[PDB]
Amino acid sequence: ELXVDXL
Ligand SMILES: CCCCCCCCCCC[C@@H](O)CC=O
C-alpha cells in the first residue's frame, strides 16, 4: 500500500 505506508 505504497502511497500510504511505503510497503
Ligand atoms: C497497518 C497496515 C500494515 C500492512 C502491512 C502489509 C504487509 C504486506 C504487503 C507489503 C506490500 C505493500 O506495502 C504494497 C502496497 O501496495
**CB within 8 Å of 1: residues ≥ 6 apart:** 7
How much distance in Å is there from the Cα of 3 to the middle of ligand 1? 11
Dihedral-angle region of residue 5 (phi above 0 means left; psi in -120 to 50 means alpha; beta otherwise): alpha
User: What is the full DSSP assignment across 1-7?
Assistant: -TTTT--
Cell numbers placing 2: 505504497
Q: Which residues line ligand 1 (CB under 6 A)?
A: 1-2, 5, 7
Q: What was the experiment behind these coordinates?
A: NMR
Give residue 7's Cα distance to chain centre: 5
How much distance in Å is there from the Cα of 7 to the middle of ligand 1? 5
Dihedral-angle region of residue 6 (phi above 0 means left; psi in -120 to 50 means alpha; beta otherwise): left
